[PDB]
Amino acid sequence: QIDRLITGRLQSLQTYVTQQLIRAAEIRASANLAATKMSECVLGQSKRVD
Amino acid sequence: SALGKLQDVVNQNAQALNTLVKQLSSNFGAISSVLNDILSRLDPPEAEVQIDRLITGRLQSLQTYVTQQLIRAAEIRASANLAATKMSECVLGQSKRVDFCGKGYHLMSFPQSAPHGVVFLHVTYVPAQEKNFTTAPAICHDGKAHFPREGVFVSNGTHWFVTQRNFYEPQIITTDNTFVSGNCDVVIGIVNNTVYDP
Amino acid sequence: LTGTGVLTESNKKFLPFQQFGRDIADTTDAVRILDITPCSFGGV
Amino acid sequence: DSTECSNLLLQYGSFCTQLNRALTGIAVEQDKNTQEVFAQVKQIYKTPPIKDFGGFNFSQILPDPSKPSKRSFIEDLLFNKVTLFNGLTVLPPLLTDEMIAQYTSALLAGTITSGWTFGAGAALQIPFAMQMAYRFNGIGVTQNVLYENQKLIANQFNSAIGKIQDSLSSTA
Amino acid sequence: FNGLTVLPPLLTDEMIAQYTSALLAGTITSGWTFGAGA
Amino acid sequence: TRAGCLIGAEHVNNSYECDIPIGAGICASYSIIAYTMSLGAENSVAYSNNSIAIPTNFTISVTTEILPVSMTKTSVDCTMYICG
Numbered sequence: 325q326i327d328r329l330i331t332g333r334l335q336s337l338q339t340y341v342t343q344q345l346i347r348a349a350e351i352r353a354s355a356n357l358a359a360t361k362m363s364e365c366v367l368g369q370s371k372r373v374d
Numbered sequence: 375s376a377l378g379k380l381q382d383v384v385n386q387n388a389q390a391l392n393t394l395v396k397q398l399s400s401n402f403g404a405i406s407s408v409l410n411d412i413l414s415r416l417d418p419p420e421a422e423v424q425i426d427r428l429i430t431g432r433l434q435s436l437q438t439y440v441t442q443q444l445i446r447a448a449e450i451r452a453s454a455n456l457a458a459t460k461m462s463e464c465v466l467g468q469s470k471r472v473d474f475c476g477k478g479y480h481l482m483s484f485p486q487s488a489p490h491g492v493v494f495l496h497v498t499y500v501p502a503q504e505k506n507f508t509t510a511p512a513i514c515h516d517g518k519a520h521f522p523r524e525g526v527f528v529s530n531g532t533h534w535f536v537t538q539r540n541f542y543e544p545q546i547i548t549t550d551n552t553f554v555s556g557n558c559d560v561v562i563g564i565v566n567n568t569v570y571d572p
Numbered sequence: 573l574t575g576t577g578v579l580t581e582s583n584k585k586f587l588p589f590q591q592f593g594r595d596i597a598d599t600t601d602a603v604r605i606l607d608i609t610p611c612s613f614g615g616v
Numbered sequence: 617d618s619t620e621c622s623n624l625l626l627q628y629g630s631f632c633t634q635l636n637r638a639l640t641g642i643a644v645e646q647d648k649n650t651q652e653v654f655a656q657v658k659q660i661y662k663t664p665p666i667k668d669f670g671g672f673n674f675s676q677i678l679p680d681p682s683k684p685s686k687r688s689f690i691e692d693l694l695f696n697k698v699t700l701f702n703g704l705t706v707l708p709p710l711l712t713d714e715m716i717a718q719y720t721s722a723l724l725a726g727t728i729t730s731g732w733t734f735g736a737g738a739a740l741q742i743p744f745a746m747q748m749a750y751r752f753n754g755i756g757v758t759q760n761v762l763y764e765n766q767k768l769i770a771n772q773f774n775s776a777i778g779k780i781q782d783s784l785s786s787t788a
Numbered sequence: 789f790n791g792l793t794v795l796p797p798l799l800t801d802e803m804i805a806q807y808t809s810a811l812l813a814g815t816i817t818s819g820w821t822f823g824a825g826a
Numbered sequence: 827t828r829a830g831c832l833i834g835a836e837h838v839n840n841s842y843e844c845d846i847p848i849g850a851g852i853c854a855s856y857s858i859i860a861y862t863m864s865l866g867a868e869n870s871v872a873y874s875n876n877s878i879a880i881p882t883n884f885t886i887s888v889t890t891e892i893l894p895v896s897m898t899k900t901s902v903d904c905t906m907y908i909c910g
């Protein structure tokens with residue numbers, strides 16, 4: 325029974341880690357976009373539309 | 375350690391591969407981590423249930439490795455898209471974007487090959503050796519407001535010249551490089567000076 | 573200890589008290605000295 | 617804290633090391649993202665005590681000596697509006713709120729004093745009217761348009777900031 | 789050795805170096821003109 | 827500190843560039859010292875409504891940027907890996 329519980333809890337932890345990794349990738353992309361915006365609009369004037 | 379990104383990517387890939395290789399030899403609750411020993415030692419029913427346990431463990435490990443590899447591949451694809459954009463903009467032309475192709479006013483870029491990446495040598499222009507000057511938005515001459523076409527009005531201590539923004543090249547204020555727009559009553563900070571007519 | 577592979581002359585030096593030898597991944601590499609190198613395999 | 621779990625997990629493998637490494641890498645990545653986003657400059661510029669920007673008002677976005685964690689009123693509203701065992705722990709960020717706020721203050725001072733010159737090297741002082749004239753020239757509008765409507769543009773900017781703070785105050 | 793293979797890259801190191809050299813030569817000898825046509 | 831407690835490093839009242847990031851604004855560097863990392867050089871720009879600063883010289887700066895383009899292509903035979 326303990327082994328079954330271990331397998332279930334480890335599977336749950338794997339799912340949580342995968343979700344966290346996907347969210348981290350999304351947040352990294354958003355942070356790269358924000359850094360680009362700060363570089364090209366706060367440190368200078370951007371001719372790009374919108 | 376000047377190529378930390380490529381070395382880090384290689385180290386992560388090697389670490390994932392080594393972790394998978396190590397996990398290949400895990401008991402996973404079975405009597406042994408060697409399949410051949412189980413087959414040459416144990417009866418077909420118990421041998422196949424141990425095989426099922428080992429298969430479950432190894433399949434879970436391989437699934438985890440494949441998920442991490444897919445995430446790393448997506449990250450590498452994003453990095454390669456950024457590198458291709460830099461190649462198209464910084465190398466094949468001149469980019470007006472700030473700090474996209476190096477710190478300062480970007481001049482050009484040179485590509486260099488790397489074992490698992492690319493290197494951009496960004497050649498840029500950086501102002502230095504600055505001096506203070508006194509400015510005025512416009513010049514009130516003959517009851518008319520004169521603004522510089524390109525550059526800025528400055529004065530060292532008493533004489534007013536017109537120069538360019540990024541370099542100190544003073545020039546005599548003249549009607550060719552200045553344009554008139556209205557009188558000198560609405561401009562805030564306008565000063566009185568002569569405008570040379572050639 | 574059963575397995576499938578190629579028996580090769582080994583240039584490595586064992587010890588009188590050592591019988592088996594395993595490289596990285598904890599897999600059988602040498603058996604008493606003869607080296608075990610699996611026969612060629614790959615994709616097509 | 618059961619010994620049987622350790623006994624049954626040592627033979628299971630090393631997935632715990634994998635998860636710990638993944639979490640550490642994620643934390644390092646977020647720290648690097650914050651470091652890249654907020655630390656665009658290596659010099660902490662400060663606004664001069666006298667504020668004569670041609671009528672433009674920046675006391676709304678500049679820090680005040682009242683010590684509200686060294687944040688502007690808009691930053692205070694942004695912080696206030698956002699509302700926030702068993703082996704789970706929260707690692708504090710490398711850059712604190714005060715440090716990020718001081719980065720923001722330095723960036724604001726550089727933008728409102730040196731324009732875009734500090735982003736390409738040393739900060740170069742320039743009157744805000746002339747910086748706005750340069751920016752108007754960037755979008756294809758001559759300097760005289762700014763110079764003959766400086767008061768109107770300053771009033772419009774102040775009104776826009778007022779609507780911004782009103783929206784951030786009541787509108788959710 | 790356990791079913792793990794490393795697939796060689798399609799483009800060799802020499803070919804990547806030749807791409808970099810060609811791009812650099814076009815940049816020096818032509819500027820940005822070669823990136824928008826002849 | 828709010829990130830925990832550190833033993834073996836002497837706390838100093840100075841501020842240097844961060845070397846080993848401990849967290850919560852606290853860094854460590856090499857005896858081993860622990861401090862609060864400095865954001866950078868602190869300077870005040872002489873702003874005025876009738877003053878400008880214009881460069882009289884220039885510098886041609888060459889910087890290096892590293893960008894990964896690809897990684898090693900690994901193929902795994904599931905039947906061989908799991909079963910052998």
Ligand SMILES: *[C@@H]1O[C@H](CO)[C@@H](O)[C@H](O)[C@H]1NC(C)=O
Pocket residue numbers: 506871872879
């Ligand atoms: C000249 O400008 C610098 C800033 O670049 C300032 O520190 C200095 O005080 C100025 N000189 C005078 C005489 O005010």
Ligand SMILES: *[C@@H]1O[C@H](CO)[C@@H](O)[C@H](O)[C@H]1NC(C)=O
Pocket residue numbers: 530531532533
């Ligand atoms: C300013 O420059 C003009 C022209 O070069 C010169 O005649 C004048 O003496 C200068 N004044 C000062 C204070 O350097």
Ligand SMILES: *[C@@H]1O[C@H](CO)[C@@H](O)[C@H](O)[C@H]1NC(C)=O
Pocket residue numbers: 562563564668875876
């Ligand atoms: C600059 O501000 C001072 C007040 O400190 C004022 O006396 C002066 O007329 C102003 N000059 C311009 C050009 O706005």
Ligand SMILES: *[C@@H]1O[C@H](CO)[C@@H](O)[C@H](O)[C@H]1NC(C)=O
Pocket residue numbers: 514564565566
């Ligand atoms: C410039 O000259 C006009 C008349 O010549 C005068 O009315 C005006 O006050 C002068 N400007 C300044 C700043 O003294």
Ligand SMILES: *[C@@H]1O[C@H](CO)[C@@H](O)[C@H](O)[C@H]1NC(C)=O
Pocket residue numbers: 672673674675676
């Ligand atoms: C800017 O706005 C604030 C709040 O409305 C006000 O207290 C301050 O006096 C204004 N500054 C200027 C220079 O008008």
Ligand SMILES: *[C@@H]1O[C@H](CO)[C@@H](O)[C@H](O)[C@H]1NC(C)=O
Pocket residue numbers: 838839840
């Ligand atoms: C504490 O910091 C202050 C200010 O930096 C300094 O004057 C003082 O010497 C420091 N004391 C110690 C014990 O480090």
Ligand SMILES: *[C@@H]1O[C@H](CO)[C@@H](O)[C@H](O)[C@H]1NC(C)=O
Pocket residue numbers: 882883884
């Ligand atoms: C600019 O700096 C270089 C050396 O970096 C020097 O040789 C040159 O004379 C300087 N320019 C001026 C106008 O002094």
